[PDB]
Amino acid sequence: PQITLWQRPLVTIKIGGQLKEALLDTGADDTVLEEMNLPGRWKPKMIGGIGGFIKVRQYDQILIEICGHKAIGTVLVGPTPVNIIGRNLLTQIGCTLNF
Amino acid sequence: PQITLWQRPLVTIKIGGQLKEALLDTGADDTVLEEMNLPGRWKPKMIGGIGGFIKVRQYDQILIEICGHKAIGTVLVGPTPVNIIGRNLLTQIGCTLNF
Ligand SMILES: CC(C)c1nc(CN(C)C(=O)N[C@H](C(=O)N[C@@H](Cc2ccccc2)C[C@H](O)[C@H](Cc2ccccc2)NC(=O)OCc2cncs2)C(C)C)cs1
């Protein structure tokens, strides 16, 4: 699709058989989801946002369908109030910025 | 131009006669720049995201040039870790998300 930015770029994603809304975010280097139970072992990560840093748990090789396009990659889980799809999964599904 | 997201989408902006580097950010409603001098009256504002809220100075009707494209809109200035061009100016240069 082509998505204009007059409104927040919110899309449905499917992860773990649940549907969630997520923001398409070119300003996030990684993908961050609200607290959920994901499979396997995690690794620690600190990510910084506008107000400072949060500790998140890194899971790898996670499938997530973003608007019907399957991506498989690293997903961080921690105390974000919005699910953010960042560049790591946006390149997989072939997303670009055009102007 | 077409920008892939293997790397951070950083572009040069021209604002208040200085060239700065800033991130094209689909996940920021607002344009938030590092401490700089801007002419005008401004208003205090609080913006938040990951990590909490920060106080910025709101300046309205600032002309920014983003890669040669002229944009007018609100610019917030303050202790942001990175220069962010948010959706309020990305729509003005005709920026879309495509996949
Ligand atoms: C409440 C919620 C439902 C929402 N409100 C909003 C409106 N808000 C607040 C914003 O747009 N606020 C912006 C913002 O931080 N947006 C964020 C999404 C968000 C929104 C609300 C709450 C938490 C996260 C998303 C933005 O792309 C920022 C910008 C950025 C990049 C580097 C350093 C600092 C900042 N990205 C991140 O915070 O990325 C964190 C990372 C993830 N992986 C690696 S770093 C500001 C910069 C203005 C959107 S959704």
From Swiss-Prot, chains A, B:
Active site, renumbered: D25 (for protease activity)
Domain Peptidase A2 stretches: 20-89
Coiled-coil features, chain-numbered ranges: none
Region (Dimerization of protease): 1-5, 49-55, 88-99
Domain of life: Viruses
Annotated function: Aspartyl protease that mediates proteolytic cleavages of Gag and Gag-Pol polyproteins during or shortly after the release of the virion from the plasma membrane. Cleavages take place as an ordered, step-wise cascade to yield mature proteins. This process is called maturation. Displays maximal activity during the budding process just prior to particle release from the cell. Also cleaves Nef and Vif, probably concomitantly with viral structural proteins on maturation of virus particles. Hydrolyzes host EIF4GI and PABP1 in order to shut off the capped cellular mRNA translation.
UniProt subunit comment: Homodimer, whose active site consists of two apposed aspartic acid residues.
Name assigned to this protein: Protease
Gene: gag-pol
Included stretch of the parent chain: 490 to 588 of 1436
